[PDB]
Design a protein around this ligand. Structure first.
Ligand code: CL
Ligand code: CL
Ligand code: CL
Ligand code: CL
Length: 298
């Protein structure tokens, strides 16, 4: 199927960026009811629109105001850019800075981006806010856009920050569950982008992954091998998961699942698991800021 894209009139529909700063009633009117609503670790709730992977967007709502959004769908409008745009073309239209300065009240903040951050996830100012531009540095293409107001940027802290001067355990579990499903869906966006079959969610595998994330946090290590609970294979077997093949990606300390997954996409070893056509299933387990993907073939 090849559709005609002919156009003679400006499209009157609001963009994701146009929603930032507007109220939730406006978001509900323009976008409809989200698929899922789940808490974040930063005071906003995510309203997730994931039923069409080509249109994937999630909006963050705090006190009935839209404060952030993350765009992953290939067809979602992100002017002056487009999802898939080459880094050289993105830069040229608005050179990307290594330093970002802002103020709240009488305090001063200066983010210092590393050379890697400038190439993988630079920041550009937008009317009343910011856009974090997530790239796949191996293909040099724009793969996501995170819009944030000033308050959200300071909470997320995506880069090193120079400046002036309470979640319950059950809320934490809800936040972790959100990070797990976002990583899952956004991994399938990557699979689709790379012409690979999508992965099926496996709950028993996800439970194994959660246990690993918790073990790393509790026992102060970061490895595929648990000093007390063994290898990936040992863990999956213990969780009653049979498999023909397995793989694992681990991450720690990223702000959220979106950030962890972009770290994996931009690392050769982790990317190999994301792009392995042999895998059929995926369970994701998150415990605080420890994120684990367990991929399986069955
Ligand atoms: Cl038209
Ligand atoms: Cl759109
Ligand atoms: Cl991060
Ligand atoms: Cl690498």
């Amino acid at each position: 199927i090849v559709k005609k894209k002919k156009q003679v009139n400006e499209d009157s529909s609001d963009t994701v960026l146009n929603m930032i700063g507007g109220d939730s009633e406006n978001l509900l009117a323009k976008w409809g009811e989200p698929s899922r609503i789940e808490p974040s670790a930063y005071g906003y709730e995510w309203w997730v629109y994931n039923q069409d992977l080509a249109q994937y967007v999630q909006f963050g709502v705090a006190e009935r105001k839209v404060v952030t959004a993350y765009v992953a769908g290939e067809q979602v409008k992100v002017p002056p850019y487009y999802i898939n745009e080459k880094y050289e073309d993105v830069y040229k239209k608005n050179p990307l800075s290594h330093e970002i300065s802002l103020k709240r009240g009488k305090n001063s903040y200066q983010f210092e981006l590393s050379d890697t951050e400038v190439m993988e996830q630079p920041l550009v100012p937008v009317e009343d806010g910011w856009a974090q531009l997530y790239f796949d540095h191996f293909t040099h293409e724009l793969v996501g856009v995170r819009y944030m107001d000033d308050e959200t940027l300071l909470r997320q802290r995506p880069y090193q920050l120079v400046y002036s001067g309470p979640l319950t355990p059950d809320k934490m579990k809800q936040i972790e569950n959100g990070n797990m499903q976002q990583i899952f869906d956004l991994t399938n966006i990557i699979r689709s982008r790379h012409n690979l079959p999508l992965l099926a969610w496996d709950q028993q595998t996800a439970d194994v992954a959660i246990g690993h994330s918790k073990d790393m946090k509790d026992n102060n290590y970061f490895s595929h091998d648990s000093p007390t609970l063994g290898t990936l294979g040992d863990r999956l077997q213990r969780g009653k998961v049979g498999f023909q093949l397995a793989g694992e990606n681990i991450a720690a300390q990223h702000s959220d699942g979106v950030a962890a997954l972009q770290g994996w996409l931009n690392s050769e070893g982790h990317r190999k698991n994301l792009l392995n056509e042999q895998f059929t299933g995926l369970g994701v387990g998150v415990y605080d800021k420890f994120y684990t993907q367990n991929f399986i073939r069955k």
